[PDB]
């Protein structure tokens, strides 16, 4: 969007004012918490867990049903990912780009885009170390 | 004003007043549309024609009467129409009230050139079409003359003060509109308490082919 | 002193950077495609005097079957358009 490039889009989601779960949801908060632990065991990431709960289960927002966020639940049960999810997906993209470039060496457009993702990694990794979500002396 | 002081409700859009507006198609407007007139537009029918709401159209009609009839000298007011279709309407309208009329091509500088022997300094100026009477409206601004205009759906509502949303492109439409104003102003002045009906003929106001 | 708000070509403030040049029809000068004056011309092969003679002597062409024409697109430089 705006960090790198000229994009100026505004697509997002708007949360409701009334944070009370609907009266037709009969599931107790114990079952919801038990159900995000099972999904996390399947190997799904926190973002994917919320979409599965919302799409086919009627739980629009976990925090409004159980009172705590998805990552908080996983951290309590010791199932959180080793490194933060957004940092994990950026490193995966940069690894595929470098694999592509080692064969197509004249692809000068992908070399410019590769420069931008590694600058994003360094800005992201600097923030996590400050709030101590990553070990000190962590390098990509 | 449709709302009469003390809640008399004497001046209202009765049934008989209604058919006259629809018979002569005084509510059918042009397919074009301007932002100034967007409030007075009610909806769009087939062939893109825009329709003016009768209530606000009738409301503006009464207000113009209360301004024309508020002058001490009826000869002071001037009514202009450069279109040939309104020459008959402006003539006989002036006959019953006493105002002055002008038709044809407007000689520029009439309201500003003191040397010219045709100097006219009215306090109220009335036109038929704002688009084709730009010269009269433009000169009126320099001398602090208010303007009452008959505006179609598309109209450059600039320097005008009281606008009557109606149709002024047809022979029947123009003649019918001056009938309501001429009939109204005399009733407020006290010539006829009700004037229901009135022996005056609308086709006399109509611009018959000469 | 700017003479034209479009600077003599149909390229606004910034939407393109470069347009492929083309040769003028008469002199062959290279000019950008959006700046060159472009017209498409369809013309008759023969004029009225010659068409009547050929049509009369041809068992193929006549009142019903019309004669073929020449269709071309012509792009000129700004100088060659004024002189012509």
């Amino acid at each position: 969007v705006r960090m790198h490039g000229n994009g100026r889009g505004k697509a997002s989601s708007a949360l409701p004012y009334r944070r009370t779960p609907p009266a037709w949801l009969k599931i107790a908060s114990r079952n919801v918490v038990k159900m995000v632990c099972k999904s996390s065991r399947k190997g799904m990431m926190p973002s994917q867990i919320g979409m599965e709960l919302r799409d086919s289960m009627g739980i629009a927002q976990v925090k409004n049903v159980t009172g705590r966020k998805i990552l908080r639940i996983l951290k309590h049960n010791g199932l959180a990912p080793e490194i933060p999810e957004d940092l994990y997906f950026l490193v995966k993209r940069a690894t595929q780009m470098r694999k592509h470039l080692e064969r197509h060496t004249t692809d000068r457009d992908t070399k410019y885009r590769l420069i931008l993702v590694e600058s994003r990694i360094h800005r992201l990794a600097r923030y996590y170390k400050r709030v101590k979500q990553l070990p000190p002396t962590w390098k990509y | 004003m449709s709302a009469v002081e003390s809640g008399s409700k004497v001046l209202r859009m009765k049934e008989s007043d209604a058919q006259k507006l629809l018979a002569m198609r005084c509510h059918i407007g042009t397919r074009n549309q301007s932002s100034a007139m967007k409030k007075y537009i009610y909806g769009r029918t087939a062939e893109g024609s825009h329709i003016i709401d009768v209530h606000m159209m009738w409301e503006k009609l009464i207000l113009a009467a209360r301004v024309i009839a508020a002058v001490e000298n009826p000869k002071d007011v001037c009514v202009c129409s450069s279109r040939l279709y309104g020459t008959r309407a402006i003539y006989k309208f002036s006959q019953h009230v006493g105002t002055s009329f002008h038709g044809g091509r407007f000689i520029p500088g009439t309201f500003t050139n003191q040397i010219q022997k045709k100097f006219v300094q009215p306090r109220v100026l009335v036109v038929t079409d704002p688009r084709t009477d730009h010269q009269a409206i433009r000169e009126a601004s320099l001398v602090n003359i208010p303007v009452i205009a008959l505006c179609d759906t598309d109209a450059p509502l600039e320097y005008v003060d009281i606008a009557i949303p109606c149709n002024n492109r047809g022979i029947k439409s123009i003649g019918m509109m001056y009938w309501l104003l001429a009939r109204e102003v005399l009733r407020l002045r006290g010539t006829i308490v009700r004037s229901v009906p009135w022996e005056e003929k609308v086709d006399l106001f109509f611009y018959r082919d000469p | 002193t700017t003479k034209r708000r479009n600077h003599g070509r149909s390229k606004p403030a910034h939407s393109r950077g470069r347009v492929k040049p083309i040769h003028c029809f008469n002199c062959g000068r290279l000019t950008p495609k959006d700046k060159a004056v472009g017209r498409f011309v369809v013309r008759r092969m023969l004029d009225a005097a010659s068409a009547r003679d050929v049509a009369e002597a041809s068992p193929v062409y006549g009142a019903n079957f019309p004669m073929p024409r020449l269709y071309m697109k012509q792009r000129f430089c700004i100088a060659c358009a004024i002189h012509s």
Binding site: - | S2, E5, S8, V67, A70, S141, N144, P146, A163, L188 | -
Partner: protein, 88 residues
């Protein structure tokens, strides 16, 4: 109380300009475009009462085409027009 008076108690204002009825803008002498409109009042019978209501608008409003909008709003507040339609 309109105008400026010194502590002595004398009004120093040589004249008091009119105020626009739409934007409360002081009408100036050099305008030559502002207008004044008088609207008559009619009693139950249907005849004028011999007096009028006066409102003044600035020349800027006329020169922008917004005079019609201002008048259609001023006349509603003062009672010389009906804000809504009737009921069947």
């Amino acid at each position: 109380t309109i105008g400026m008076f010194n502590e002595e108690g004398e009004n120093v204002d040589l004249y008091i300009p009119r105020k626009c009825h739409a934007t409360t803008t002081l009408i100036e002498a050099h305008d030559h475009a502002a207008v004044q409109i008088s609207i008559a009042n009619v009693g139950p019978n249907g005849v004028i009462n011999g007096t009028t209501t006066t409102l003044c608008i600035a020349g800027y409003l006329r020169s922008q085409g917004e005079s019609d909008h201002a008048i259609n709003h001023i006349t509603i507040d003062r009672g010389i027009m009906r804000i809504k339609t009737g009921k069947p």
